[PDB]
Design a binder for this molecule. Structure first.
Ligand SMILES: *[C@@H]1O[C@H](CO)[C@@H](O[C@@H]2O[C@H](CO)[C@@H](O)[C@H](O)[C@H]2NC(C)=O)[C@H](O)[C@H]1NC(C)=O
Lengths: 167, 56
């Protein structure tokens, strides 16, 4: 019934990658290219993309919903332009998760102008567990995650109506 | 292994996902490995995943 959205990896902390170039005409905001706000599309810096190794320990008492993604580019040339490294992965581990993602190149129809694709993943990180990310490219990294602070009866109701100001 | 019995057989096997490249070499020498398994219906090819994981 309620999150508290918390910052788990500051966008300002990416000292070896570009963190503010991951924007797209597919995601416009107020006339400018933008992107999903809660994750960060990391881009190589000075023609290099050093291997990322970052961890976050859930020091709260509440479970945490963590979201991240991978970018599947259009061709090899785009792969190099964005990430330098031609052959890349993102590995993710917790006490239960054991994931190792690899970008897929395919030739795809444009949707919202883009033939590339972003694929998102999630996990629930229990109190006192940690999540460990490793990648040498294509990583759409967490910035914000959601602490679950209230649980209870709820439902997702499908309706075209909007608020009625009543009880 | 050929099942020469009249009864179905439940067969179990596994793969180890190590912690890092160094452990991979220490245990198995070969850096890049697989396990392939086939029967009349199974067509499997497993690959170890390195990730950095919490101790359990
Ligand atoms: C996440 O952080 C906590 C530390 O705040 C870790 O829990 C501690 O583990 C150490 C052993 O190295 C103990 O001495 C402390 O008593 C533990 N504290 C608590 C609150 O349990 C925890 O191991 C970390 N999680 C992971 C998976 O690394």
């Amino acid at each position: 019934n309620h999150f508290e959205k918390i910052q788990i990896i500051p966008k300002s902390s990416w000292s070896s990658h570009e963190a503010s170039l991951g924007v797209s005409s597919a995601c416009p905001y107020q006339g400018k290219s933008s992107f999903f706000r809660n994750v960060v599309w990391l881009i190589k810096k000075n023609s290099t993309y050093p291997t990322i190794k970052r961890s976050y320990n859930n020091t709260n008492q509440e479970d945490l919903l963590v979201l991240w993604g991978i970018h599947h580019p259009n061709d090899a040339a785009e792969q190099t332009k964005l990430y330098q490294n031609p052959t890349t992965y993102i590995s993710v581990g917790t006490s239960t998760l054991n994931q190792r993602l690899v970008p897929r190149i395919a030739t795809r129809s444009k949707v919202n102008g883009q033939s590339g694709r972003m694929e998102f993943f999630w996990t629930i990180l229990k109190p006192n567990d940690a999540i460990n990310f490793e990648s040498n490219g294509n990583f759409i990294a967490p910035e914000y995650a959601y602490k679950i602070v209230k649980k209870g009866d709820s439902t997702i109701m499908k309706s075209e109506l909007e608020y009625g100001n009543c009880n």
